[PDB]
Structure formats: structure tokens, C-alpha cells
Ligand binder design. Structure first.
Ligand SMILES: Nc1ncnc2c1ncn2[C@@H]1O[C@H](COP(=O)(O)OP(=O)(O)O)[C@@H](O)[C@H]1O
Ligand SMILES: CCn1c(=O)c2cc(C(N)=O)c(N)nc2n(C2CC2)c1=O
Ligand SMILES: [Ca+2]
Ligand SMILES: [Ca+2]
Ligand SMILES: [Zn+2]
Lengths: 69, 462
């Protein structure tokens, strides 16, 4: 259940469904979701999870962020 | 993970946000089966899978060529998604029927433009961009097995920032225009991504103009498409933050163009004979558009057209070099035909110099004009002198490239007598008269050939 829950959470931010959360997608989703975050916090949210340094967050990086107690 | 809570707060808000398309009750539409084709632009490979779709019977929006349908589709990444939780998608099709390959080439276009957005983002811009992934669904049970494009629905104000034909948007945003200009510079002028449109900085249905103009469909207007962009492009702080070179516009063009919330962050990074050659063709395309009335505002701007014709000639465009050579020589010309330049001794030197450059670059028309100048003095710059040996070098180069028997007979005439630095050569004169006689026979001028044969015997009788 939590696996599917994490997969559904990834699809919330991967707005185009290409498997990678980009900074522009995260900015659009946070703005649409009413969440109040500056354009720099969004870029920092990506950088914190961007382990491979490609500027985007794939599903595994997203899992490691969420399943990281 | 100093933002893990920010992820959770957004995930929970989303679980409580309402479906913006609930009022349309797409879940009640009969489900349809389709084969989905998804493209990978880095690998060039396609992945196919089977999907279930619910598409509205009528389009909710359209453009000149394509219409959009509200669509719901089950995810194949999720394991047990119910239709109550299906995401919202936009299905697109051409209003008039097109070839099936158009749909596949359009996906290659969009995914290639998505790669250019990722390159732009790697230069640390103030606002990052993203081009939405587009795929193809094939409705094999529908009559004709029609193809549709499919992408996720982006809620918000859909705005067209620029077109593929020179339009610019009026609360002007800097990022869309800087992205387009970036693609021109970073690609070495080989392409430009335009038709930037979407919600915020999430773009869809872009168009790419390329130097060849052979791929990416009929929206690829080639170097003409790059000219339309730079005719209205006002470089902004992002253009200059990335070191993008401005396009050389005319004084009138710059003022009309010169006639913003996105602020820099101090981290923006900076972005060949081929590019300068393409740049010359973009300048020449501006000349033709000025002459054709594409840039109507009064009467068609002749001065700005000449401004771009000179820039094109200085960048090596042979058509511009020939055109300016004829115009500065007060000769008839194809490009800017109704435009005439002031006869002045300075221009008559420039006219011959341009024609000489064009001759040395392979233009047959300029080679005949240069030959005649060194022969008779006609259109010869006063800095130069009649030189029959030089005239010979340009006649024969034209012959080895109007009638060929005329130029061959002229060469023989000059060699029969000599003059203007050319020593007489009767044997060569008879040889060339023989070649001219043979050329006259191949042109059905038999009586003229007998005259050339007779002139050959006389030159040899010396
Ligand atoms: N172009 C592509 N080629 C291959 N796999 C892809 C492609 N785009 C996305 N994927 C994979 O498919 C998953 C999304 O599947 P799905 O939810 O069925 O797509 P959509 O969100 O377009 O409906 C992504 O998380 C990624 O693993
Ligand atoms: C043909 C070009 N084109 C789109 O590609 C498009 C995409 C989406 C989307 N992916 O959400 C959307 N919402 N709207 C769109 N429109 C407007 C008419 C409504 C378009 O014209
Ligand atoms: Ca994505
Ligand atoms: Ca990554
Ligand atoms: Zn610019």
C-alpha cells in the first residue's frame, strides 16, 4: 500500500509523466497546489534529492527521500 | 532531507484537491483500448504498451491545425488505479487528415525540444523551463485506426508567448524569448526552438526551425523562420546574462523592437564558420521578406533591406555579393530589383570588387561580366585597367563552368590580333575558332559555324 502510495505521490509532481520531476514541474505543482514556496526553495528541494546530479528527481531518488527516516 | 515535510504537505493537499474536470464526467464515457507509443530522444527508441482511455466526443480547444480533447487514462506505472483516480490528459489530432508519420515526427520534435529545455536549465537560468512529454495513442478499434497525440493536462492560463512566424506577446515575459534565442546560439545557429506556448514555463507544441528545413514537419520554415524570430526579438537581461550575441538589426528595426518580473540571480552561466554562414542566410531571408511585404507596418523598407543585404554579403552569401555587385554597378539585379543605388565612383569600385569576388566564388554571370570589363572596359572599375590576358582567364573559366560559341569566338578574335597586354597567338586563335564552329553546330547555327571555320583557316594562314 505504501509502495503504491509513494508511486501515486511521484505522479503528483512528475507532471508530464516522463519519470523525472523537473524544477519547472515542481514549481507548477506547488503553485497549483496552493503551497507557498519561493522559486529558490523549489530548486533546493530538487537539489536535495538529486543524487545523480542531473537536475531532476527520478522515482528512486524520490523513494529515498520519502523512505529516509 | 530538510524539505521532506514540504513534500508531504503538498501530497496531502493534492489528495484533497478536487478534479478540475469532474464537471465533464469523463468517467461515464465508454472505455476504449489503445496502443501507446512513447519515444526516447536520447536513444531514438520507441516503447509500446497497451492503455485504456476515455476521450470526450468533442474538442474543448483548438488552433489552426490541431484540436484538443479532454481525456482520462489509467496509469501503467500504478498497479491498481481505478477510474476515480485517473489523471487528466489532453489528446490532440490534426483537424484535416495528415499522414501517419507526421504524428511520429511531431513526437520527435517535442522530445528534441524537451532536450533543449534541459540544456537551457543547465545554464542556471532565473526560471527553469520544461517541454511536456508527448506520445502517440493508436485507437485500433476505431474506424481507420486513427492516431492521437497525448500529454498530461496542465491546469492554468494557456498562453502563446511566440509563434513560428514572428509573433511575440503585453505583460512580456523574458524566459520564453531567452530560451528561443539560447537554442539558436547553443546549436551553432543550426536550429531554433520557437512557438513557445503553454502554462507558465511548462511548454507544449513547440516548433523547431533548422538550417536545412527538412525535418520536424511543415512548421520548419528554415532560415526564414529564424529571420522572423530575430526581426521582433528584443534581447533581455537573460539573453545577456548567458552571453547571447544580439542579432544585427537595422536602425529602423531596432527602434520598432525597442518601442518585467523575472530578475537575474547572478548565477547564470554563459552559452564558427558554419554559424556565420547560416547567419548570412538569415540576413538574406530578411531581405526577401522586406521585398515581399512580410514586414508591413508604410511602404516596404528598402533601406533596412539593403542593410541586411550588405550584412549577408559580408558574411559570404554569394547571392548577396552578386546582388550588391550589380546594384553598385548600376546593373539590373534580381534581389531588390526595383531598388537603385547612387552612381558614385566609390560605388563603381565596390561594384566591380563584389563582382570579382563573386566570380572567384563560382558565379558564372559575374565571371562573364568581369571578362567583359577586362576586355572592353564596360563596368570596369577605374582603379583597374583593360587586361586581355585577365579577360581570357574569365571567359574560359565561364566556358569550362551567353552563347558559348560567342565567348569562344571572342577569345579567338583577341588572340588573332593581341592587345591590352595580350600577345597574339594565331595558332590558338584558329584552335578557338574551331571550338566555336563546333559549338555553333551543336546549336544549329550551321552558317555561323562555317564562318568560324573560315576565320580559323585565316588565323592559321598567318
Ligand atoms: N518516454 C518514455 N519511455 C519509457 N518509459 C517512460 C517514458 N515516459 C515515462 N516512462 C515511464 O513510465 C512511467 C509513467 O507511466 P504512466 O503513468 O503509464 O504514464 P503517464 O503518466 O503518461 O500515464 C514513468 O514514471 C516512467 O518510469
Ligand atoms: C494545439 C496546441 N495546444 C496544446 O497543445 C494544448 C495543451 C494543453 C495541455 N497539455 O494541458 C492544453 N491545456 N491546451 C492546449 N491548447 C489550447 C486550446 C486549449 C492548444 O492549443
Ligand atoms: Ca517530468
Ligand atoms: Ca536526479
Ligand atoms: Zn536575445
Amino acid at each position: 500500500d505504501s509502495e503504491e502510495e509513494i508511486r501515486e505521490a511521484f505522479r503528483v509532481f512528475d507532471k508530464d509523466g516522463n519519470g523525472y520531476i523537473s524544477a519547472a514541474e515542481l514549481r507548477h505543482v506547488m503553485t497549483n497546489l496552493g503551497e507557498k514556496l519561493t522559486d529558490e526553495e523549489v530548486d533546493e528541494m530538487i537539489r536535495e534529492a538529486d543524487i545523480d546530479g542531473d537536475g531532476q528527481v527520478n522515482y528512486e531518488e524520490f523513494v529515498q527521500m520519502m523512505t529516509a527516516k | 532531507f530538510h524539505f521532506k515535510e514540504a513534500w508531504k504537505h503538498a501530497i496531502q493537499k493534492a489528495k484533497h484537491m478536487p478534479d478540475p474536470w469532474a464537471e465533464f464526467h469523463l468517467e461515464d464515457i465508454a472505455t476504449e483500448r489503445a496502443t501507446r507509443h512513447r519515444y526516447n530522444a536520447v536513444t531514438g527508441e520507441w516503447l509500446d504498451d497497451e492503455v485504456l482511455i476515455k476521450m470526450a466526443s468533442q474538442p474543448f480547444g483548438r488552433g489552426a491545425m490541431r484540436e484538443c480533447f479532454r481525456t482520462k487514462k489509467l496509469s501503467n506505472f500504478l498497479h491498481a488505479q481505478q477510474w476515480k483516480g485517473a489523471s487528466n490528459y489532453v489528446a490532440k489530432r490534426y483537424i484535416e487528415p495528415v499522414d501517419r508519420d507526421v504524428y511520429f515526427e511531431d513526437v520527435r520534435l517535442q522530445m528534441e525540444a524537451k532536450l533543449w529545455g534541459e540544456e537551457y536549465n543547465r545554464h542556471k537560468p532565473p526560471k527553469q523551463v520544461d517541454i511536456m512529454q508527448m506520445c502517440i495513442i493508436e485507437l485500433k478499434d476505431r474506424p481507420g485506426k486513427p492516431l492521437f497525440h497525448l500529454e498530461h493536462y496542465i491546469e492554468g492560463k494557456y498562453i502563446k508567448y511566440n509563434s513560428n512566424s514572428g509573433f511575440v506577446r503585453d505583460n512580456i515575459r523574458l524566459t520564453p524569448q531567452a530560451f528561443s534565442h539560447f537554442t539558436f546560439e547553443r546549436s551553432g545557429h543550426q536550429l531554433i526552438v520557437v512557438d513557445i506556448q503553454g502554462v507558465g514555463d511548462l511548454y507544449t507544441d513547440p516548433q523547431i526551425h533548422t538550417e536545412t528545413g527538412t525535418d520536424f514537419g511543415d512548421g520548419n520554415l528554415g532560415v526564414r523562420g529564424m529571420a522572423l524570430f530575430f526581426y521582433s526579438h528584443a534581447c533581455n537581461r537573460i539573453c545577456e546574462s548567458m552571453g547571447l550575441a544580439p542579432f544585427d538589426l537595422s536602425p529602423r528595426e531596432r527602434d520598432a523592437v525597442n518601442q518585467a518580473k523575472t530578475i537575474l540571480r547572478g548565477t547564470e552561466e554563459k552559452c564558427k564558420k558554419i554559424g556565420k554562414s547560416i547567419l548570412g542566410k538569415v540576413h538574406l531571408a530578411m531581405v526577401r521578406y522586406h521585398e515581399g511585404g512580410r514586414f508591413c507596418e508604410e511602404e516596404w523598407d528598402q533601406e533596412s533591406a539593403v542593410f541586411h543585404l550588405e550584412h549577408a554579403a559580408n558574411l559570404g552569401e554569394l547571392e548577396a555579393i552578386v546582388g550588391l555587385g550589380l546594384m553598385y554597378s548600376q546593373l539590373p539585379h534580381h534581389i531588390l530589383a526595383d531598388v537603385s543605388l547612387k552612381e558614385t565612383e566609390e560605388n563603381k569600385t565596390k561594384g566591380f570588387d563584389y563582382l570579382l569576388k563573386a566570380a572567384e566564388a563560382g558565379d558564372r554571370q559575374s565571371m562573364i561580366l568581369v571578362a567583359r570589363a577586362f576586355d572592353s572596359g564596360q563596368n570596369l572599375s577605374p582603379d583597374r585597367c583593360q587586361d586581355w590576358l585577365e579577360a581570357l582567364h574569365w571567359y574560359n573559366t565561364a566556358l569550362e563552368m551567353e552563347p558559348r560559341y560567342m565567348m569562344l569566338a571572342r577569345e579567338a578574335e583577341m588572340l588573332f590580333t593581341g592587345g591590352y597586354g595580350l600577345e597574339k597567338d594565331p595558332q590558338r586563335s584558329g584552335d578557338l575558332y574551331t571550338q566555336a564552329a563546333e559549338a555553333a553546330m551543336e546549336a544549329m547555327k550551321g552558317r555561323l559555324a562555317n564562318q568560324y571555320y573560315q576565320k580559323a583557316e585565316e588565323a592559321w594562314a598567318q
